[PDB]
Design a protein around this ligand. Structure first.
Ligand SMILES: Nc1ncnc2c1ncn2[C@@H]1O[C@H](COP(=O)(O)OP(=O)(O)OP(=O)(O)O)C[C@H]1O
Ligand SMILES: Nc1ncnc2c1ncn2[C@@H]1O[C@H](CO)C[C@H]1O
Ligand SMILES: [Mn+2]
Ligand SMILES: [Mn+2]
Length: 509
């Protein structure tokens, strides 16, 4: 329409040279080799599950409407519709990707109705492989497996009487009178919906995103919780570049992507359209008004009202890592165009555990249930980011690089002396002896381990600067959160300074 060229108009309208298309085809070839795509069959199986889910959404609404003494024609007209968002919505999902699904219902259909009626309607089916309703998440959701496909299901209820099949959620007004949770549920689809609408060629955009997703995950800079961009972040970033080069191939895009983003005058934010305004008393991203927004280091703003910063977590250290990976990209993709390097080069696994002379090892323990460790450790994990910030600001610390994948492991811990022992360094549970009588019964002890790469300023001081305060603190805050956490009988947290030379063998597996 015009907005497909971004807020600065394109950088160049030039088409792709025959040579550039050759490199683009080889790029897609590599992606295929990496099994990025799925088979026409598996795609067809997702279309089918969704088709059924739509059928169930209508049935859900219809049934609830009837119980409200509605006409046979009105219960039908009340409608009910299914929307997707996430990986599948953008068309960059993979063989094992789940399908994030939003269910929209009229005013008279409540969330309670959702976990009751809709749920029951799901169970009344053969294809239901399993259901894990978690009604109290930040965004109420019902997680299920259907016909061998994972489906995330959240429910949004609009302040209107009907939800027709034609309804699209672009209108800013659909948000009227909604509550925090419903409002939160609409945002996902509204955002992915706009991304696809602000890009010149959605197909060029998809291949380039698959590449960036792969790349980011291999270079260990794809994890929102640790201060790196998440999926939506990476997507908007690719789209901003697709905007700049309307008719280039995905290959030239990845190159311009790395160059521009590494030279970008951060914290100038990246946006796909002019930040809008509106009704709701809700805050919109605005660094002039809100301090919290003035501190975002690399802002990537969502286009759908109300605009938020998808990269809030980024710190000064992860910021450096990200620039570093961008630079390595300028260098490698420039080589791939000179015929001196290949795409596989670009997608090479990182070497986190080989690059620093020291590391901070954080381990969370749990002598209890699988749900207790998932909770405890899930807390520590989320807080690691705070430590990176306390750490990267002290004396002479050049960087505090948080790795992005904790190391999980549990042991059959029968005694008490066995617990207050496995955390001093006892049969390593395994996918082999997991459901075996003797094992499956045995009480367990879990532990999740995380690392922070450290680089001390090689200035010329007599000695490195002790990081005891920040560490002990991080411990405290992590315990001082719940009464159960500050126990010691079930939960434990330890931090050990480790030289690159003494890293655990499991870290290189
Ligand atoms: N902390 C969060 N707050 C709000 N929305 C979130 C948060 N974390 C994830 N999301 C939403 O969840 C959506 C689905 O993500 P998820 O299913 O985990 O992966 P995806 O991004 O769809 O990739 P795969 O499904 O892994 O290919 C995408 C995003 O809009
Ligand atoms: N704001 C949000 N909108 C939609 N889904 C969300 C969400 N926050 C979390 N989720 C769900 O949480 C999972 C990813 O963290 C899958 C995704 O559907
Ligand atoms: Mn998903
Ligand atoms: Mn999901």
């Amino acid at each position: 329409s015009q907005k497909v060229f971004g807020i600065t108009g394109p950088v160049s309208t030039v088409g792709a040279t025959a040579a550039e298309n050759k490199l683009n085809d080889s790029l897609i070839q590599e992606l295929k080799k990496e099994g990025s795509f799925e088979t026409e069959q598996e795609t067809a199986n997702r279309v089918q599950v969704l088709k059924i889910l739509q059928e169930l959404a209508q049935r859900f609404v219809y049934e609830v409407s009837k119980k409200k003494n509605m006409s046979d024609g009105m219960a039908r007209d009340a409608g009910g519709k299914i929307f997707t968002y996430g990986s599948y919505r953008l068309g960059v999902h993979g063989p094992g990707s789940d399908i994030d699904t939003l269910v929209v219902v009229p005013k008279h259909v409540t969330r309670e109705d959702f976990f009751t009626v809709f749920d029951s309607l799901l169970r009344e089916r053969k294809e239901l492989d399993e259901i894990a309703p978690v009604p109290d998440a930040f965004v109420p959701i019902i997680k299920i497996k259907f016909s061998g496909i994972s489906i995330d299901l959240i429910c949004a209820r609009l302040d209107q009487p009907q939800v027709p099949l034609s309804l699209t959620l672009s209108d800013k007004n659909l948000l009227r009178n909604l509550d925090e949770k419903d409002l939160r549920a609409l945002n996902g689809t509204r955002v992915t919906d706009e991304i696809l609408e602000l890009v010149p060629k959605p197909n060029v955009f998809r291949i380039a995103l698959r590449a960036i997703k792969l790349w980011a995950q291999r270079r260990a800079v794809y994890a929102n919780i640790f201060g790196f961009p998440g999926g939506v972040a990476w997507a908007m970033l690719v789209a901003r570049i697709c905007q700049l080069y309307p008719n280039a191939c995905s290959a030239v895009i990845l190159n311009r992507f790395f160059i521009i983003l590494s030279e970008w005058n951060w914290p100038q934010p990246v946006i796909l359209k002019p930040i809008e305004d509106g009704p709701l008393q809700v805050r919109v991203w605005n660094p002039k008004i809100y301090a919290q927004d003035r501190s975002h280091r690399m802002p990537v703003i969502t286009p759908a009202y109300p605009s938020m910063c998808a990269t809030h977590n980024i710190t000064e250290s992860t910021k450096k890592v990200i620039l570093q990976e961008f630079v390595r990209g300028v260098q490698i993709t420039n080589d791939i165009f000179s015929n001196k390097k290949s795409w596989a080069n670009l997608f090479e696994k990182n070497d986190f555990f080989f690059r620093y002379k020291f590391y901070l090892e954080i381990t969370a323990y749990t002598r209890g249930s699988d749900e207790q460790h998932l909770k405890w450790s899930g807390l520590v994990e989320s807080k690691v980011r705070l430590l990176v910030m306390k750490l990267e600001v002290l004396a002479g610390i050049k960087i505090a690089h948080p790795f992005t994948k904790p190391f999980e492991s549990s042991y059959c811990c029968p005694t008490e002396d066995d617990y207050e022992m496995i955390q001093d360094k006892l049969k390593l549970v395994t996918d082999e002896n997991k459901e075996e009588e003797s094992i499956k019964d045995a009480p367990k002890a879990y532990l999740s381990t995380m690392y922070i790469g450290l680089d001390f300023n090689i200035e010329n001081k007599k000695e490195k600067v002790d990081i005891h305060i920040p560490c002990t603190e991080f411990v405290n805050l992590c315990r001082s959160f719940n009464e159960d956490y500050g126990d010691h009988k079930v939960f434990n947290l330890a931090l050990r300074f480790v030289k690159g030379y003494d890293l655990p063998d499991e870290v290189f597996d």
